[PDB]
Design a protein around this ligand. Structure first.
Ligand SMILES: [SeH]Cc1ccccc1
Ligand SMILES: [Zn+2]
Length: 258
């Protein structure tokens, strides 16, 4: 009876196995755009993905991860609110059953159709498993998806999903350039938070871009054909794999822009 996104095992149940679910810096949160303060001391983000080496795509039973070679400084996030260098390890998405829901963060209570998470770990802790034990261990770049025009740079991901339909399936996924998933502007909001899936560790500096990317209805419909279940098991479509907004508590959201 493992955690997931159902009635009997969804987000309102996670606290029984993971008591930090009710902690002081949980994610996601609603971003109240009028309350977020412009912090003129924040720096421009530095997103350096030109040497990124993608390896594999995995259906892990709760999302799909596009995994990168993180054995060297090849794809790194620095600047903005960050001290030091964070290495890209994977990206994944969270999405809905319908276009009106799917994002984890919200903006003035608005839900987007999906949300991309580019996960990076702080190289001063040496490995990802050590980094998640630290309050500044991870930096996650969050990007909202709205449905409209297709995102050309997403199509290579969309077209491999039929090969990883069910939990535990993986496929080779080399030479994928994550620069084709970025919006034009790197304006962002930032706050201290957590992983949005168990173990819900409070180790993340969140950097949430203001500008959403557009994807087509056909692109998101293919996300919604994935399965939470393993091969041969009753089909349960992989939809609504998002955690709702959590209490902000004693936190301030800072804006990079006026
Ligand atoms: Se919800 C972002 C995230 C997912 C898996 C591991 C680290 C961070
Ligand atoms: Zn995520």
């Amino acid at each position: 009876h493992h955690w997931g996104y159902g009635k009997h095992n969804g987000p309102e149940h996670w606290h029984k196995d993971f008591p930090i679910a009710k902690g002081e810096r949980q994610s996601p949160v609603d971003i109240d755009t009028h309350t977020a303060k412009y912090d003129p001391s924040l720096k421009p983000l530095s997103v350096s993905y030109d040497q990124a080496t993608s390896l594999r795509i995995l259906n892990n039973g709760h999302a799909f991860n596009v995994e990168f070679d993180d054995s060297q400084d090849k794809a790194v996030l620095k600047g903005g609110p960050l001290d030091g260098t964070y290495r890209l390890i994977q990206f994944h998405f969270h999405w809905g059953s319908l276009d009106g829901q799917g994002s984890e963060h919200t903006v003035d209570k608005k839900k987007y159709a999906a949300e991309l998470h580019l996960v990076h770990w702080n190289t001063k802790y040496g490995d990802f498993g050590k980094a998640v034990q630290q309050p500044d261990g991870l930096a996650v770049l969050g990007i909202f998806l709205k449905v409209g025009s297709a995102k050309p740079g997403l199509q290579k991901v969309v077209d491999v999903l039929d090969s990883i339909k069910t939990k535990g399936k993986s496929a080779d996924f080399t030479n994928f350039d994550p620069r084709g998933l970025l919006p034009e502007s790197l304006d962002y909001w930032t706050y201290p938070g957590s992983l949005t899936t168990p173990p819900l560790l409070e180790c993340v500096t969140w950097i949430v871009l203001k500008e959403p990317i557009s994807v087509s209805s056909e692109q998101v419909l293919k996300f919604r054909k994935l399965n939470f279940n393993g091969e041969g098991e009753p089909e349960e479509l992989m939809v609504d794999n998002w955690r709702p907004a959590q209490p902000l508590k004693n936190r301030q959201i800072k804006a990079s822009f006026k």
